[PDB]
Amino acid sequence: HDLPEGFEFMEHKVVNKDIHAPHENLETLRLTLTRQDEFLLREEPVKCVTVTGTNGEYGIYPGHAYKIVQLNPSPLTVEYTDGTTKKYFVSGGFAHINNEGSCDVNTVECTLLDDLDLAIAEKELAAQQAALGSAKDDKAKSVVEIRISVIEAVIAALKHH
Amino acid sequence: ADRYQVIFNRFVSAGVQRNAVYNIPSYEKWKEDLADAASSDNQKNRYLFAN
Amino acid sequence: SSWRDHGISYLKYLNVCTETLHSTVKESRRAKYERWSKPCYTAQRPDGAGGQETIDKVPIHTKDY
Amino acid sequence: IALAGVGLGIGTIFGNLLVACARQPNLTKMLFNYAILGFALTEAIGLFALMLAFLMLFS
């Protein structure tokens, strides 16, 4: 009746480094990207990862100090040591940075920037703007503002490149 | 609520299915335990993450 | 931004953002992504008569937030 | 007057020390030692001025 803890099935535990330990110069960062409980990268070695948190943008490189970031709807960039850039777009979630050389970005929804379309965003933005005036109450206005902000961020990311 | 315990089923292989449990300590007491993980040497795996 | 002042929780904010993101996906991939948002569920309690009295503790759809 | 920039400098080090100890309690040994090492490299400058003061006060 010793209920096996669900985490025990997952043997890929997090590698945390002790404070007093000697330093190691790392050349790659182990990135773990997850969408709706589905990982796209499994401890992939990358040169750097750019993530847009609440306060601002962050460029995470190997050896970055341990930190927790609350992401916002925005693009995410991954640059490999080879010299290849891969861009996704996330709607939210958290990013955990470890001083040991790991970065786990678990987002509610992470989709390729290519999969998104421009005209679809434009029409949706117009509809939300029209519906904002006809908002039932304050809560509806805030919800529409959230939707508008997400669409604007998507459009800005597409127009950037 | 002191805790929320989710009991579900886990699928190891095509036929080996077991019962698994997720415990979610209520925030109020999770904050208190995160305190011990930040100060005392106790809980070393959760020292950096806690900090 | 302004949704916190109205009592909306963070999880509901995440759900709305994901639903909007899915609505912005192309038609082809929308077949898959849109499945990951549709809230097809309810909350019920069986009563003495056997009827499944539906509960209203939490809204199901985003529009009900 | 040079001591004004010295006494303040010490407070800055100790001010940072408390913050550092708050977010890395285990590594108090390194932080405290470095604080006292710097306090001596700021006290030196304080002694620099004090010597000139005594020279211009007793001569």
Sequential DSSP letters for D6-52: HHHHHHHHHHHHHHHHHH-GGGHHHHHHHHHHHHHHHHHHHHHHHHH
Place of tokens 């005594």: D54
Q: In the Cβ-directed half-sphere of D23, how many Cα atoms lie within 13 Å?
A: 8
A21 CA to chain D: closest CA distance, Å? 11
B36 and B43 Cβ atoms separated by less than 8 Å: yes
Eight-class DSSP state of B40: S
Phi and psi at D11, nearest 5°, equal -60, -35
Q: What angle do CA A42, A15, B8 make, to 5 degrees?
A: 65
Binding residues of D for UTP: 23
CB nearest B20 (choices: A4, A14, A19): A4
Query: Cα separation of C52 and C44, whole Å?
Result: 5
- Contact partners of B by the rule of 3+ C-beta pairs under 8 A? A, D
Residues of C in contact with A125 (CB under 8 A): none
A75-100 burial, b at 16+ Cβ within 10 Å, e below that, comes to: bbbbbeeeeeebbbbbbbbebbbbbb
Eight-class DSSP state of A115: T
Residues of A in contact with D20 (CB under 8 A): none
Resolution in A: 3.5
Q: Give me the torsion for CA of A22, A27, A30, A33, rounded to 10°.
A: 140
Q: Would you say A67 is a known binding-site residue? A: yes
Query: Cα separation of A113 and A157, whole Å?
Result: 8
Residues of C in contact with A120 (CB under 8 A): 24-26
Query: Cα separation of A102 and A113, whole Å?
Result: 24
End-to-end CA distance of chain D: 19
- Secondary structure (DSSP) of A33-101: EEESS-EEEEEEEESEEEEEESSSEEEE-TTPPPEEEEEEEEEEEEE-TTS-EEEEEE-SEEEEEETTT
Contact with chain D for residue B51, Cβ under 8 A: yes
Name the CA radius of gyration of chain A, rounded: 19
Q: In the Cβ-directed half-sphere of A57, how many Cα atoms lie within 13 Å?
A: 7
Contact with chain B for residue D22, Cβ under 8 A: no
Query: Cα separation of A115 and C28, whole Å?
Result: 9
Q: For residue C17, give the 3-state DSSP assignment.
A: helix
A60 and A97 Cβ atoms separated by less than 8 Å: yes
Q: How was this structure determined?
A: cryo-EM
Query: Cα separation of B6 and B21, whole Å?
Result: 6
Q: Which two tokens stand for residue A103?
A: 């970065």
Contact with chain D for residue B39, Cβ under 8 A: yes
Contact with chain B for residue D29, Cβ under 8 A: no
Interface residue ranges in chain B relative to chain A, Cβ cutoff 8 Å: 7-8, 10, 12, 18-23, 44-49, 51
Contact with chain D for residue A20, Cβ under 8 A: yes
Q: Structurally, how many domains does chain C consist of?
A: 1
Total residue length of chain C: 65
User: Which segments of chain C are extended strands (E)?
Assistant: 44-46, 52-54
